[PDB]
Design a protein around this ligand. Sequence first.
Ligand code: HEM
Ligand code: HEM
Ligand code: HEM
Ligand code: HEM
Ligand code: HEM
Ligand code: HEM
Ligand code: HEM
Ligand code: HEM
Ligand SMILES: [C-]#N
Ligand SMILES: [C-]#N
Ligand SMILES: [C-]#N
Ligand SMILES: [C-]#N
Ligand SMILES: [C-]#N
Ligand SMILES: [C-]#N
Ligand SMILES: [C-]#N
Ligand SMILES: [C-]#N
Ligand SMILES: [Ca+2]
Ligand SMILES: [Ca+2]
Ligand SMILES: [Ca+2]
Ligand SMILES: [Zn+2]
Lengths: 54, 142, 142, 148, 148, 168, 112, 177, 141, 141, 151, 151
Amino acid sequence: DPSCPDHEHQCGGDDPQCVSDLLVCDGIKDCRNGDDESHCHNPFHAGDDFVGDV
Amino acid sequence: SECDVLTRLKVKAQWRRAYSHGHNREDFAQAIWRALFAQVPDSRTLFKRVHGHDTTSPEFQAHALRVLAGFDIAISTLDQPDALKAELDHLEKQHEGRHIPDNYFDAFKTALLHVLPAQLGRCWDKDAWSACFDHIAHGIKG
Amino acid sequence: SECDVLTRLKVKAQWRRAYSHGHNREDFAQAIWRALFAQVPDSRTLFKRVHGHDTTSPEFQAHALRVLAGFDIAISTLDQPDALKAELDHLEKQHEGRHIPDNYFDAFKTALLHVLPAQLGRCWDKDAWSACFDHIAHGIKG
Amino acid sequence: DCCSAEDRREIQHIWDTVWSSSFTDRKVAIAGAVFKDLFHHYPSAKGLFERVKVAEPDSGEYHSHLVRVANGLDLLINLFQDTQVLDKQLAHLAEQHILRKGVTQQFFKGIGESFARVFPQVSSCFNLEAWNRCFHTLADRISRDLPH
Amino acid sequence: DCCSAEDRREIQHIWDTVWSSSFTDRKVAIAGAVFKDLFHHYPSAKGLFERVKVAEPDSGEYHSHLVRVANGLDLLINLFQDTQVLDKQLAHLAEQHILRKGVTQQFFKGIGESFARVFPQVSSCFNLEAWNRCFHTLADRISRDLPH
Amino acid sequence: EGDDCKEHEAPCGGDVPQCISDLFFCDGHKDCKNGRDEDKEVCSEVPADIGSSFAGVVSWQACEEATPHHAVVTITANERKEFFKPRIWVRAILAFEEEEHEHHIKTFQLRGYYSFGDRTLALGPERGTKPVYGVRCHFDRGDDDHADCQIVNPASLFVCGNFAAERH
Amino acid sequence: VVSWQACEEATPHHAVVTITANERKEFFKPRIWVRAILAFEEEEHEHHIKTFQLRGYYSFGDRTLALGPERGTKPVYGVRCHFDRGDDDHADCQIVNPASLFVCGNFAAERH
Amino acid sequence: RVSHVEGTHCAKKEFQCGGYDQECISDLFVCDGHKDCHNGHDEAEDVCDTSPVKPGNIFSGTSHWHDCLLRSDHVTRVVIKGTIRRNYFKSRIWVRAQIESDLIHDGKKELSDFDSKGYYNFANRRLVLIPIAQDDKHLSVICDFDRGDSRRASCHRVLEGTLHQCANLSVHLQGHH
Amino acid sequence: DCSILELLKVKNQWREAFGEGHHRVQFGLELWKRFFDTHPEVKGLFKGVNGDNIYSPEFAAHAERVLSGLDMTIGLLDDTNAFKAQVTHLHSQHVERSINPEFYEHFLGALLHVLPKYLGTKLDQDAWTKCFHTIADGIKG
Amino acid sequence: DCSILELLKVKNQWREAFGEGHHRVQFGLELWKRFFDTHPEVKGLFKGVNGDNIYSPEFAAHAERVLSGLDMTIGLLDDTNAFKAQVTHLHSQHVERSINPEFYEHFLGALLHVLPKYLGTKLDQDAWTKCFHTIADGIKG
Amino acid sequence: HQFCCSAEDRNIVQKQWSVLWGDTESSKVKIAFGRLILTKLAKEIPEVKELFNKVDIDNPEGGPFSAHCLRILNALDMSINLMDDPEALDSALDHLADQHHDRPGVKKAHFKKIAEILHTGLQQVLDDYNALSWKSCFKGILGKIASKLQG
Amino acid sequence: HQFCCSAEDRNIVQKQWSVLWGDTESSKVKIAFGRLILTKLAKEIPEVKELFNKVDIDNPEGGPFSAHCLRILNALDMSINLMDDPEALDSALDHLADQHHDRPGVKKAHFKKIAEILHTGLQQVLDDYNALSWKSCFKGILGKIASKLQG
Ligand code: HEM
Ligand code: HEM
Ligand code: HEM
Ligand code: HEM
Ligand code: HEM
Ligand code: HEM
Ligand code: HEM
Ligand code: HEM
Ligand SMILES: [C-]#N
Ligand SMILES: [C-]#N
Ligand SMILES: [C-]#N
Ligand SMILES: [C-]#N
Ligand SMILES: [C-]#N
Ligand SMILES: [C-]#N
Ligand SMILES: [C-]#N
Ligand SMILES: [C-]#N
Ligand SMILES: [Ca+2]
Ligand SMILES: [Ca+2]
Ligand SMILES: [Ca+2]
Ligand SMILES: [Zn+2]
């Protein structure tokens, strides 16, 4: 079952916490463990190709 | 055993369980066909028109389905001997001219009698099926 | 505390919660027994007839259930003093002749008072249970 | 060898593969076979059905009769988990059979035997033992108060 | 210290361990105890129940009365999440108590005290604070328009 | 997690989910886009090997009024027809663990099949042997050595009891 | 697979012996008392398989599984398995006559 | 966690033996010193580990309130102060503990603590602590050591009578003040 | 005028209401509850089977017999011979009792009232009235 | 003639309908909806409690009082003394209002109509009518 | 063994029996039911009433007889709940047979009668009652209890 | 292609068509329905009846004609079930077109009529019938079958 309200983010860790989806990766720490500010690596880089099979 | 009124009823019910739910029906058909062609691979030449070389082709699917439909009419009318005789005559006409050894019909039977219990998986009677198949096949041959 | 009209009502309700649902009832019984025999292992000799050496035997299960049934009558009639007196006299007769030290009754009490809160797990009163058990046990002894 | 709850649940479950349809064809065929067997083994009983034309087994009267039986048995089996109602319906059926003179308990044992002979021919995984154990229960109630 | 929603939910939940049965025995015993306490502390009020035969506490009249009270309280508590209906029933009960002369607000404070004294004796995990906070609410409505 | 397969279909497994027929597993032709229906592990015929026996303690819910004891089902014979390879036809025996005092053990002879795609051992009464019991074992622990079994009624597939089977 | 020398006139087929129950008395531990079943692999056409119920013991020092007819079950067959391959998984078995211990057949047993 | 999603076929107050295993047992027989499972799982070491309630343990976590009280998120500590385990009834450990809460109520910080008592039940791995003679609106605490270890627990602040959950709390051992 | 498609439809919907044993009993009982509620003038006819108490075993067994016979007739809807034979058999079972022939219309009324509660499909009222009438016509003299 | 098994049965089924608070209110309201639907002649008696609007708080509180009293009497069914006392108390609460004594039969009618919708078991109509009548008899003069 | 009082039979019996004892005054109901059964037995077979002299049957509303009705009802409850475990059930029923043997004057015919009375009452109180299973099982239970009787 | 008899259209058609064949005597229903459709076609366009002389349409209750009604109904069933696989469907429908070409006298107008009759009947028998999807798909099916007709 989801650990968080429909539009929130689970900070995870041994001390869980929910934080608004709009506050993840905005450069301001909202999680007590700063999880919202360490995801911040975009998988897509200019030039990347992904190939999807049906 | 022989094709009683009763054992015909049994075969009819089991065929309902196996065929009547058009889900895996083309797969049921094709399984029967892979088995048949595995036993008598020389028979594939009779099916050039309908792509017997590739049983996954749409033309051969259409075929195997036509077959199972005919067989379905035959089973469905096991308790209506007039209609059964009619369908069997029809199939016979559709098959005359084609040089089909008893060999191949035995292949078909063996195929059906192995795919059927795999389909039902449960309560089925190979003797009743043997008898009634023999009746239908005799009907198609002459 | 002492066995009031009220605290008797409380004990009665809690006993309902613990005993009345014949699921783990034989297990409840047997837990009580393992505790008792753990405290005073010399008492097992009194139960030779009913296989006190193996509390998992069907004979001993039947026993422990008989017990809990008697105790159930006793608790159920805490608010019906005439009936309570009757059942207590009956149990007393069933127990007279058997050399049972107060020792063993204290073992029984302690067993019950440890298995009970494990069963209920929640809202229970060990003082009320102590009082009412003391009343019933005094009734069985004389 | 009583009629266990398992036996009754079994029969109730397998029952929808023996006839049971929006059409009466299977009922007629199977019940018809049951009676062919009965009359084969106890031919004296065949006289009891002149009123329905046992004499013309393709007749609407005899068909409708067979269907009446089949549906009667259906009714009995459907009531296996409603013992009171089963008892009343059993009594009703019994009286219906008492009105008919010449119907004996022996004929009922006979029809039990013929049912047990016919059913396993029309459906696989038919629990014959269960059927026997339960039929005994049904028939012994229907056929009591009838000539031994 | 008002009567919170939590308090009401609490009372509603614990309530089925204090009497509440298809039988009236527990209601009679417990309500009876409540009144023994009330009369012990405010003996002047005992006169108000001659009509229901307090002098004979084993009488059907007095029993039936106790049950009437218990069920009245039941009705009140069951209406905790239906404030409008609770208000109407509260008014009704109030007028029923205005018809009886000699019934004062002081007697109501008294019975609140005796309830609070009795309930924790018959069930563990009974929230006494919640009970007090909510009873104050109920009684202050029933007993207004009465005489201090 | 389950799968979006239909009756008479089984998942191919692998990175891109695909469902194919029961009747297409291990028949020598690749029907999966990734060929998994012909994988050597998928098509392991070990769960139906002669001498294979799977045992475990049964919790009953009907049919048998005995308390939890072991059940063992032992494959005594097999046959995999070369023209129809997606099934292994097996003869097995269901037996129950009974006390030292019983000395009148009950033994049920079964026949059925192992289906590769289903990963299922399905057993019913041997020819002319009183339709008492059938067995359904599902090898879903990721190996050929454990299976979730039910002792069922051959007709209704009604569950009489369950045991967690383990290969011994 | 069993090579027969008497009793059974069938050609080499499998034999399987399955332990169905056991009991190791705590006061007499050098034996494990077992209930087993000897069964034979038979053709698709037979459909009337033969099953023999056995009881006996496993002896640790002997490394021997010794089986004979279950109580009241017609003294037809007994089994002697010797686990002498260095593990609990292979055994040299003989299907014998319960009385004479006469060898009817031999099979190299393997745990499956 | 997976085993939690799966559930069991056992009744309440029952203990399922193995992981896949079908045998059920009364939770009054779990870690009582007697082998009750066909596989002896009810007396296994992982099952019967007594370290979740080893006295001296200080579990700390953040309490998130959503009922009963109107507190903002705040630290709570469950401090194990003592255990009693009767040799005649080993099925359960009777735990005594102190529940502390750091509340930043009115501009400044203030400790809210109370003494409590309850039990750890091996079968469901559950620690129940109800407030010792604390009518003073201190809520009970129920912790489940359901994270695979004896170091972390999923807790709730609850009302004792109804088991209504007023707060979500997840403690980890950390432990040393 | 109960034609092929009519009787086919009625057969199907009947299978929906009566073919499931778990709600066949509720169906029968509710049919009767409705019938007796809206036409209590009818109850007199059923003194033999406690029609005043539909929750009794007597009446339950009755309702069961009813639904069974109705099943037979609906199932014989396509076999004209056996149909006529069955309907005359029903006639024999009803002619002895002084039954107002317009009670059958009321019976159909209750049937149509109760049916949709046990149908996963939309009640084909035309087909049902037509077939019910081709049955009742035969039951009546 | 409301004997031991009768009153035991009625007690049980009553516990089913009234013992669950989540559907007690629906039960009361539906009882009244039915009563007033099938006997609107009765509505005049309840002007004091907005009987014309059963969805009002006045009437809700009323229906609650009803079910409560019915609970008391059903619960006192085994204590003859306290029963008689309670039933005469109900009598006092009804005698002042000119109530047609055959309205009680109609009340029972609505009760028996609504009850099975809140019973997981089959309604024991005999037990219910017998006990209801041993109550109403006492309520009436 | 199976068929006569099978596993499912026992499940049905237990499930249906469970319906009676819903509330907290189950004791009241057990006493009422036991009193009914017993006094009905004393009416049907008058020679029986003398056998209950030591439990004061002449005052059925009295203490001793009430406690006794609890005794029988609880024995019945126990035996029903024990149907899962045939060996334990057998042992308990055996103890009961012993107890009824020590009361001379108790005869098998009395048990036949009380069987009839029991089933008749259960048909009324229980809303769901599978007579086949109940009779199947109680034939064996009452059979075993009356098995050590002289007459 | 999409829009005209789309994927969902086909799903609807299959799902709704499945409702008819619930029980074991599906053959009876297929024969009845086929007989209805065909005789209605012979009434609407009388020149058609002669074309079914070899299947004994003059005795519609007869064996040969019944077996034939099974032929058409099973072809229809097959083509409906084949709508998942457009290529296979196309092949089967092509075979049908071939078969109807070898029967001189069969004209496209007959197929237009039988389309009308078919939809009218299906509106009755089916309780749930999405006319838009059904007509969308059968336009294409019947279209393809009548595609090789001379007239
Ligand atoms: C009793 C089992 C069989 C049944 C029910 C059956 C039925 C059918 C059917 C329905 C057709 C399609 C006729 C048409 O629409 O033109 C057909 C054609 C054909 N059959 Fe069979 N058949 C059976 C066994 C066999 C056997 C064993 C053989 C020998 C391999 C065989 C050889 C053929 C051939 C070569 C065709 C021509 C396919 C084409 O090009 O259209 N059949 N049969
Ligand atoms: C107040 C708690 C107790 C209650 C309610 C109780 C009740 C019972 C009951 C119902 C029986 C069955 C008698 C029969 O059916 O004939 C029994 C027998 C017996 N009791 Fe207790 N008992 C209690 C405490 C004890 C104590 C502490 C002991 C000393 C260990 C004890 C020793 C025995 C013995 C030796 C028997 C007979 C054993 C046999 O059946 O062979 N009881 N008691
Ligand atoms: C297998 C259990 C049986 C069932 C469920 C059954 C059912 C029925 C039914 C439903 C009827 C129609 C009664 C009516 O609608 O008025 C009937 C009539 C009859 N039964 Fe049976 N029956 C059974 C066994 C037997 C036996 C063994 C015999 C002895 C041959 C028998 C002899 C008759 C006769 C003579 C009639 C009168 C039919 C007539 O009107 O001519 N029945 N039965
Ligand atoms: C705790 C809140 C109370 C509740 C819910 C309550 C409930 C009731 C009920 C249900 C009745 C019966 C009315 C009827 O059925 O006509 C009643 C009557 C009465 N009440 Fe109370 N009561 C409460 C407190 C009190 C107090 C504190 C007193 C002061 C001693 C009191 C004095 C009376 C008297 C004298 C009657 C007359 C009874 C009779 O004559 O039959 N009540 N009350
Ligand atoms: C087409 C709808 C009906 C069907 C299928 C039907 C069928 C039946 C059946 C099967 C029986 C049982 C006869 C027996 O076994 O002896 C029966 C009896 C009876 N029918 Fe109907 N019936 C229908 C309509 C009606 C009508 C409209 C009434 C008038 C209210 C009616 C009044 C009765 C009565 C009074 C009995 C016998 C009651 C008794 O046995 O005590 N039926 N009917
Ligand atoms: C045995 C079934 C019945 C029971 C248990 C019952 C019980 C009650 C109760 C408890 C009250 C509340 C009195 C008060 O709060 O002062 C009441 C009032 C009343 N009852 Fe009934 N009653 C029953 C049947 C009926 C019948 C059949 C009628 C006729 C329609 C009726 C008409 C009324 C009226 C008009 C009132 C007072 C209306 C008002 O307060 O404005 N009751 N009844
Ligand atoms: C319905 C199954 C029955 C059950 C479960 C049952 C159970 C019991 C029990 C538990 C006792 C108490 C023994 C003790 O505590 O010392 C008892 C006593 C007794 N039973 Fe029954 N019984 C049954 C049937 C009968 C029958 C049919 C009779 C024949 C009249 C009978 C005659 C007696 C007598 C005379 C006593 C002596 C009571 C006393 O003196 O205290 N029982 N029974
Ligand atoms: C509704 C779509 C139709 C389908 C699915 C269909 C299907 C069939 C099938 C499967 C056959 C059997 C051919 C064989 O196996 O040899 C057949 C035969 C035939 N069809 Fe149709 N058909 C349809 C519409 C029509 C219509 C509109 C006509 C115009 C009268 C027609 C005229 C014929 C004729 C004359 C035969 C010859 C039957 C014989 O003599 O054996 N079909 N049809
Ligand atoms: C077909 N061939
Ligand atoms: C105690 N026995
Ligand atoms: C009978 N027929
Ligand atoms: C208040 N009585
Ligand atoms: C008709 N009844
Ligand atoms: C009444 N009201
Ligand atoms: C019996 N007592
Ligand atoms: C075209 N039939
Ligand atoms: Ca942030
Ligand atoms: Ca493949
Ligand atoms: Ca243990
Ligand atoms: Zn994150």
